[PDB]
Structure formats: structure tokens, C-alpha cells
Amino acid sequence: SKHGLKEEMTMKYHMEGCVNGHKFVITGEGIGYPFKGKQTINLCVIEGGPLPFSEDILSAGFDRIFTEYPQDIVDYFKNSCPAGYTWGRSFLFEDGAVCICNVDITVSVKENCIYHKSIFNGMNFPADGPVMKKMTTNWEASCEKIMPVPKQGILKGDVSMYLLLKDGGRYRCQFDTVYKAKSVPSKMPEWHFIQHKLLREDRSDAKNQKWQLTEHAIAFPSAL
Amino acid sequence: SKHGLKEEMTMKYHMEGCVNGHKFVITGEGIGYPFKGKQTINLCVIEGGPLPFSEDILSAGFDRIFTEYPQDIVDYFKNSCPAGYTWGRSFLFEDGAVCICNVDITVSVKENCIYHKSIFNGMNFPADGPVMKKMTTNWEASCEKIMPVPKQGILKGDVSMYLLLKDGGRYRCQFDTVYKAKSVPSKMPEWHFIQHKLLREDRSDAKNQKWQLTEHAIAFPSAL
Amino acid sequence: SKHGLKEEMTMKYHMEGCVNGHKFVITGEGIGYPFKGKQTINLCVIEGGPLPFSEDILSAGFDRIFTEYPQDIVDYFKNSCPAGYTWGRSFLFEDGAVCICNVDITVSVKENCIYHKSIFNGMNFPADGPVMKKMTTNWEASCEKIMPVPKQGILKGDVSMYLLLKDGGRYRCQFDTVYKAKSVPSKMPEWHFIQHKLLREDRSDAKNQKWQLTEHAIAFPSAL
Amino acid sequence: SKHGLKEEMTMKYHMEGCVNGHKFVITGEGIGYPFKGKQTINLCVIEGGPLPFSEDILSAGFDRIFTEYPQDIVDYFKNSCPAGYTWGRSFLFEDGAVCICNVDITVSVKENCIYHKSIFNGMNFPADGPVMKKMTTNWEASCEKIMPVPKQGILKGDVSMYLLLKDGGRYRCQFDTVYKAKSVPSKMPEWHFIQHKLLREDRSDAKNQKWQLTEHAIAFPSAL
């Protein structure tokens, strides 16, 4: 009954970061449906709260295993479990801001709980920007392009993202990810697409900055 | 029997360009199915042939009206016919090369023939690159993000493209387009996706550099 | 008494362009001191005036021969006269706008007058930007890096520019130029620097959009 | 006898990083002439050696206080001593690689020794690139543009860098730094230039990966 995973698991999160020189630590928990491509996490700022920047920039920082993959398409992420995998991503904001996230996913054996260890670093978030002024609401749903790296055993992800502005309008960020399974897979997917729907809902109280994230993602092939 | 268009039309092309300082003129013809999102053009180099760069860079240079749009999604392009529309696009190659294309589409009334007047300019195509060394085969199929511009009556297109290398491997180009209907539409689509499949087949002979292009494109909504 | 040039010459300008779909033609004249690295031009909008965008974006569009070169440093531009040379440049604005300029410089023999034929194309200048809202005053002085291209007989120029905002503050544009002498030089400069001081002064009247530009530029070696 | 600094000091370095997922720790020491704009450091890989990437990418990672400033130009860095300052920088490589460095400089009171605490993160360094293949020799000397940030009490640095290739040729990296004094200065420099000369000399032995860096930098005003 498992590829290391179950139809319903639990996940743990521990992020350490530094944005525009501001250090912070975060811990999270959630439950998900790897096979359905659905997940719900609860974040809490253990160190450095309240954060001075939008929680939005960290979202994608907080696991491709939560993707519904068709039979016809090879599932790189799931085939790496429970050993897991690591990933790296650069965030290129339209206003010069630059972020980098690196993560370690590891499927807990007997716990039915997926772990993720991340480090988030960013700088150049303009003081009068939507990030530092917390003027962002959510990311718009997307379509990411996933492509195998020949002779390297890794996957490349490419997605142009848009953060929705409280004041209406979009805010652009270019995502470029490197997906690395902990072991050379016998199998490798052909290039494909992944559609995402990341949503955020703050839940802070004058005693703790906390919030919830949700994600639904589905892999598809070119409709050609 | 027409939105200005028919299930089967004909199109004319006249491109004037300059790539890495090399000037050229091109004329083309084809037949298409606006409603099916299918088209086939035949290009011929009238001036400046043989071109010293890949024909591939010009492809996207050579009409969103050839897109199958679902009922539920507003069709900006078709609603602009037959008056047509113009579009602008910057091409950002991964090796520094930069191109700009600007076009004028105009639906011929009684001819059932769509016209397109373009000007293509590019420079910084490295001499030892896949473009100048003609090492490219085709563009990989894609998914473009289409979004309405509030208060402006125009559409923005965003697509990360990949040119396939003869020698295997990808070559990246970032596309950013501005779509402008000749008149303020009463209607405006919500943001959506467009999937493309552009193919190329050279047909040159030691007496003329000629070639054929084909395209199939389908508009979709977020699968969320 | 001349490298094709004199201590004081005259120059002619004819620019044809299209910015954000708006076409225009421009003609200019001036006098300069190639050897002093000083020049003064007078522009006039022959077609498409009044322009809807800042005149500022065209400035650099309107000749390295107007650079004071030290003895110790080879002067690529001057050594190409009077045959002249061509150059290409991509303009990468911080707000997505993209421009491309291509030029032909040709030293008139018996006229003591330098000619320049340019084509300027640009798009994606946001409607609510400093360019379309004409909120710019001048470019800040700069330092450009000039480097020889091995095995190619051309020069590369690299400069991060800043347009001054009426409302105070900077507006960034990345410049990347390719300098190509019409003939393979026996000599080639080593990489060096060029410092610039481009200024603008409008002179339009309710009967013609006209303006003046000035430039002072000096080549230097690394002060190391 | 000091602005917190002396004509000759000592400096300590402790870097923690992660490049393309590879973690490492580094410690260094040197002696310098803040007022002469000269410094010499000795690096040693305490953790994660031998590094799999060029030492070159870390160089600029390893203090503007080592800059010769003219009287006429305000010295932001020195005026922050000995309290010191922090700085942030994004590194944008031409092949997609992205790095981020954040540092804390603190002038030791009675030690005459300047401390620097850094964290370096980078990813997307292509496996077949000059960084991962260690094909780089040194950075070419440069000219950086330094500009005050109005209403913010910080400095912005902008420099287009070139790494020299063993195999001849250049490798581009765009530098964008934020300089932040620990306290609001009464004084603020006007925008200016800084010219640099960073050199590297490996000194590793089959028992330790160690190396030496040197730097000479001089602030100047526009020569206009």
C-alpha cells in the first residue's frame, strides 16, 4: 500500500531565511494528497516575526510530490520517495529583487510524514514595493514547464509567475528551478506541464504571525 | 456566414528585417482555419537571401486569429476582425541576442485573405551561436499566458520558448507580446492560456531560399 | 591634415523609427570635435511628431568617433574612417520596455561631414511609465566598458544607464552595443573605458518638435 | 589616530554557503590599508572542501572600507566604522546561475581587526559551465557605479563583471549591491565611481584547499 507515500500524509516544515537582511525561522505542518495533487499547510513565525515583507514571496518556498500525475507521464518526484529529493530555485522579481530557495524533502518511513528543510534568501526588495509594503494578496494560477535534463538525472522547471496586487494589477516574478532526485532514476519523464493553484490565507493574531497555504497541481502533456 | 472570417481563408505576408546588421525582405502565403487554430504558410526570401541566420528566429514573427477559442473564453483577436490588429514583441535570447517584431494584421474584405505587415529587427546573435551557425531545428510546443490589460484595451502575452538544437538540447528565448485591437472592444477576455505547436520545414533550392511553416494553437482556461 | 576627419566637422542624421507602434522620421545636424570628444546636434521631427514618448530614449541612438582617445589606446572608430562603421544596440529598460537601434556612419569625403543612418525600434513602454508620460529629464553621466572581440574584428560596449526623473530618482536601462568597423583593422584596442556626458535641451515650438543634444566623451584605461 | 580604523589593520572572515546544493564553510585572514584601498586575504575551506565550483564566484563575496576615497567625495563605508555595516548582493550569471551574498562588517575596537560574517548561496551553475568545470582564472578589473538612495540612508552599487576564461574569452556576471550603514549618516556621498582590481592565486595542497585574494580599489568622480 505505498510508493513510500499514502493517499493521505502529513508534512513538516522548517525554514530559515534572510530577506533584505532580515533573518527569520519558520515551522509548519499540514496534510496532503500526493496522488490528488492537493495540500494544506499551516505556517508559524518562530523567529523574526512579524516579518517585514509579504508572506507571499515564501509560498513557493513551502514540494512537487503533491502533483497529480497521469499514467502516461513519468513521475520523477514520487519515484524518488521515500528517499526524497532536493530542489533549488532562483526568484527574479520585476523590480530587481532576487531570492534563492534550496530544499531537502525526505519521506519519513514509519511516520507517514514528509519532511522539508529549506533556506530562503532574498534581497533588493524595494522599500516602496509591494513586497515590503505588504500589498500583495495571492499568486495567480499557473502553468509550469517541466523538462528533463539529459545526462544529468535532474529536472528543470520554468514558470513566469504573477502576484496579485491588493490595488489590482500584477507583479512579476520569474521562477527557475532545478529538481534533483537523490538517486539516478531508471525512468525519466518527457517534458511536460504542471498547472498550479496556490492560495494564501493569513491567520495571525496579536500574539503570533501565522498563516495557511493551499495547493492543487496537475501534470499534463502538450495538448498538441 | 462570417465574423469577418471564414472557416477557410488565405493569408499574405510581407516582412522587412535586419538581423545582426543583415537586411532582408520576405513574402509569404498560406491557407488557414482560424476557427480550428490551424495554419500553413510558405515563405520566400525576396531580398537578402540566403539568410545568414536560422529561419527559426522569424517563425513567431510570421497571428493569434489562428487560435481555437472556447465559447466560455472571449476571443480578442477574432473580435477585432476584419479591422484587424497590431502586435509587438520583444525576443530575449539566452545568449544576449535581442529581437523586436511589430505587425499589422488586416482582414481583406472581399478577398477572404488576411494580411500581415511586419518588421523584424535583431542583433547580438553570437557568431558562434546556434542562430548564426544555423544549428536549430524547431521550437518546442508551448503554453503562453494571455492577460488583459486593465484600462488599456490590450492583451499581454508571456511565453518562455525553447528552440531545439540539432545537436540535441534546448536554446531559450523569452517572448513578451502586446496585443492591440484596432478598436476598444466591448468585451475583454479573462486571463487564459494558449498552447502552441509551431513546426518548420525548409524547402530551399539552389535558386531560392524558401520554406514552410505550420501552426496549431488552442486557448484554454486554468485547469483549476 | 586628416584621418578622414578634421578637428571640426559637421554631421547629418536621418532616423526612422517605431516606438510602441508609433512610426516617425527624424533629421538632424550638428558640428563636432572628434578629437576632443565633443558634439552638438539639432534634431527635428519630420514625421510622426509630436512624439508620444520621451525624446530621451533616442539620445544614444543619435557616434563613438566623438571620443577623445589617449595615444596609448587604440582608436577603433577613428581608424575606420572615413569608410565609417556600423553599430547595433539593444536597450533593456527596467520596466520591460525593449529597444533596438542599428546605425550606419559614413564620413563624407569632400564635405567634412559625417553621416549617420539609423533605425530605432522599441516597444513595451508602459503607458504609465516615465517614457510614455514624458517624465524624464536627462541621462546621468556614465562609464562604458569597451572590449575587443577576438577573432571577430568588432568591439563590444557595455553600459548601465540611468535616466533622471523629473520627480527625482533614477530609471534604469541596460545598454549592450556591437561596434563593427567596415574593414578588418590591423590594430585592435585593448579593453578600456569610455566616460560619457549626454545632455538634452528641448527647443520645440507649437509649430515643430525640435531639440538639441550635446555630448562629451573620454576614453580611459583601468586606473589600476 | 583613527576613524575607527588605522592605516594598517587586520581582518577576519567566516563564510557559510551553499552552491548548487553543495554546503561549505570558510575562514580567512588578511591585512589591509583601508586608506590606500588595498587588501590581501588568505582563505581556507574548513568545511565542504574541495569545493566543486570555481573559487572565483566567492571573491567579491570576500568590504568597501578598502577603498581610497578622495577628500571631495564622501566615504559612506568609513563613516560607518567602527560600527560597521551590512551589504547584500545578487549575482546574475550569463548562463542562468544566480547567487546571493549577505554580509556583516564590524570593526573590532581594541583589536585593530575588521570582521566580516557572510552567507553565500547560489544555484543553477550549469554542470558544463566554466564555474562547475573550474575553467576560470580571474575577474577583469572594473568600474562600479555607486549611488545614494534618497530617503533611505543606503548606497546602491552597480557593476557588470567579467570572469576571464582559462580558454580565453569572457564570462559575464551582473552585480547589484545594497550598502547599508548601521546608522543614518549625517553625510551622504554624491553618486560616484569605484574602480576595482581583484586578483586570485590558489595555494591549495593535497591536504587543504586554500587560496589568496588581493584587492585595490579607488573612488572617483565623473571625469566630466
Side-chain angles (χ1 to χ4, degrees), chain C residues 4-204:
Chain C
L5 323 157
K6 311 265 219 141
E7 307 181 313
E8 183 191 273
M9 316 194 250
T10 38
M11 29 276 209
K12 296 211 225 128
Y13 309 89
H14 174 273
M15 182 185 283
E16 288 225 346
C18 191
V19 173
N20 290 23
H22 171 117
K23 273 89 154 278
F24 60 83
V25 179
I26 293 168
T27 51
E29 314 223 49
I31 81 169
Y33 313 96
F35 299 94
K36 304 272 189 191
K38 290 178 163 171
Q39 62 185 317
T40 300
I41 298 318
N42 295 96
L43 299 314
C44 201
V45 194
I46 291 343
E47 256 169 64
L51 313 164
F53 59 76
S54 201
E55 342 177 309
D56 294 310
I57 77 180
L58 306 187
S59 289
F62 292 103
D63 180 354
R64 278 272 68 59
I65 110 149
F66 293 99
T67 308
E68 202 206 328
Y69 265 93
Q71 261 105 260
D72 16 291
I73 293 162
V74 193
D75 189 327
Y76 188 89
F77 316 104
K78 297 236 175 47
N79 295 341
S80 80
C81 304
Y85 67 118
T86 62
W87 63 260
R89 176 180 296 155
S90 65
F91 308 58
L92 305 192
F93 289 99
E94 48 156 297
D95 46 19
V98 184
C99 298
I100 297 235
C101 202
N102 165 269
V103 194
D104 205 2
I105 334 258
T106 272
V107 184
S108 166
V109 300
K110 10 208 77 231
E111 286 192 46
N112 202 36
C113 153
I114 326 199
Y115 297 95
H116 328 74
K117 241 244 232 312
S118 70
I119 23 246
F120 195 98
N121 297 299
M123 44 74 41
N124 258 324
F125 267 113
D128 306 291
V131 169
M132 301 313 277
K133 293 258 140 281
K134 292 138 155 252
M135 298 284 304
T136 55
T137 83
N138 278 289
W139 291 99
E140 201 156 56
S142 60
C143 178
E144 162 185 25
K145 187 169 211 175
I146 309 284
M147 60 229 142
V149 165
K151 308 151 135 264
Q152 311 210 15
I154 70 200
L155 250 49
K156 302 268 130 159
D158 169 18
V159 55
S160 174
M161 303 270 273
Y162 297 90
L163 198 40
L164 303 174
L165 298 175
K166 276 161 207 195
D167 73 73
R170 305 213 161 54
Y171 173 53
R172 214 176 170 193
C173 180
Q174 160 75 208
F175 279 23
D176 304 278
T177 323
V178 184
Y179 303 102
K180 278 199 179 154
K182 283 145 176 207
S183 153
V184 153
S186 31
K187 301 241 152 7
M188 279 257 168
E190 275 195 345
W191 77 262
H192 56 292
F193 289 126
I194 303 203
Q195 283 192 34
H196 311 266
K197 212 229 215 144
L198 222 190
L199 285 165
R200 170 182 67 87
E201 104 151 284
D202 185 58
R203 272 103 161 297
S204 332

Side-chain angles (χ1 to χ4, degrees), chain A residues 18 20-21 23 88-92 96 98-102 119 121-124 126-128 152 156 176-178 180, chain D residues 18 20-21 23 88-92 96 98-102 119 121-124 126-128 152 156 176-178 180:
Chain A
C18 191
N20 290 23
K23 273 89 154 278
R89 176 180 296 155
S90 65
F91 308 58
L92 305 192
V98 184
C99 298
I100 297 235
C101 202
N102 165 269
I119 23 246
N121 297 299
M123 44 74 41
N124 258 324
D128 306 291
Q152 311 210 15
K156 302 268 130 159
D176 304 278
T177 323
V178 184
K180 278 199 179 154
Chain D
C18 191
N20 290 23
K23 273 89 154 278
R89 176 180 296 155
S90 65
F91 308 58
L92 305 192
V98 184
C99 298
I100 297 235
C101 202
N102 165 269
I119 23 246
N121 297 299
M123 44 74 41
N124 258 324
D128 306 291
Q152 311 210 15
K156 302 268 130 159
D176 304 278
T177 323
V178 184
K180 278 199 179 154

Side-chain angles (χ1 to χ4, degrees), chain D residues 46 60 62 107 132 168 176 192 200 203:
Chain D
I46 291 343
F62 292 103
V107 184
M132 301 313 277
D176 304 278
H192 56 292
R200 170 182 67 87
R203 272 103 161 297

Side-chain angles (χ1 to χ4, degrees), chain A residues 86-143:
Chain A
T86 62
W87 63 260
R89 176 180 296 155
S90 65
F91 308 58
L92 305 192
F93 289 99
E94 48 156 297
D95 46 19
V98 184
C99 298
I100 297 235
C101 202
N102 165 269
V103 194
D104 205 2
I105 334 258
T106 272
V107 184
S108 166
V109 300
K110 10 208 77 231
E111 286 192 46
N112 202 36
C113 153
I114 326 199
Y115 297 95
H116 328 74
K117 241 244 232 312
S118 70
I119 23 246
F120 195 98
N121 297 299
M123 44 74 41
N124 258 324
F125 267 113
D128 306 291
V131 169
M132 301 313 277
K133 293 258 140 281
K134 292 138 155 252
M135 298 284 304
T136 55
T137 83
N138 278 289
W139 291 99
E140 201 156 56
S142 60
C143 178

